[PDB]
């Protein structure tokens, strides 16, 4: 099954928003194969979340991730005027990278 995400989401500065993701897969290695990448307008993406209960080093604490069943969630503690960008959830369970459909974020 291919990944799916909401068409978009809205918010405002200081508010805590969240983004969802459905259509994940599994294997003998676990079920934590979900990663979120934030791609600004007209430039290379950047890794934001991996191992949803974790994240890369140096990543601001303004973001957080969690999973529940076949659905995942990307929690953000606070938006900013510069946070307007696309977000894609991606699964790499069965040695096959299947990016998400993409969801827009605005204020």
């Amino acid at each position: 099954s291919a990944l799916t995400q909401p068409p978009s989401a809205s918010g405002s500065p200081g508010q805590s928003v969240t983004i969802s993701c459905t259509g994940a897969s599994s294997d003998v290695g676990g079920y934590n194969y979900v990663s979120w990448y934030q791609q600004h307008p007209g430039k290379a993406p950047k890794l934001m979340i991996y191992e949803v209960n974790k994240r890369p080093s140096g990543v601001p604490d303004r973001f957080s991730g969690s999973k529940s069943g076949n659905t995942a969630s990307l929690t953000i503690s606070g938006l900013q005027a510069d946070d307007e960008a696309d977000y894609y959830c991606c699964s790499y369970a069965l040695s096959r990278v299947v990016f998400g459909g993409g969801t827009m974020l605005t204020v």
Binding site: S26, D27, V28, L94
Partner: protein, 50 residues
């Protein structure tokens, strides 16, 4: 070719004396048809672990 020839082959001789000298062999009725009766189901998670 006939019961006498199999009797000879069991005796290993060309001159059989009088009697029931050999219990030639047994009559195994042959299997005429073959049957395979497995179950029915779907594919397997082949590479969900490999």
């Amino acid at each position: 070719l006939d019961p006498l020839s199999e009797t000879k082959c069991t005796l290993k001789s060309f001159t059989v004396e009088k009697g029931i000298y050999q219990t030639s062999n047994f009559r195994v009725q042959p299997t005429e048809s073959i049957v395979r009766f497995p179950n029915i189901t779907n594919l397997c998670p082949f590479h969900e672990v490999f």
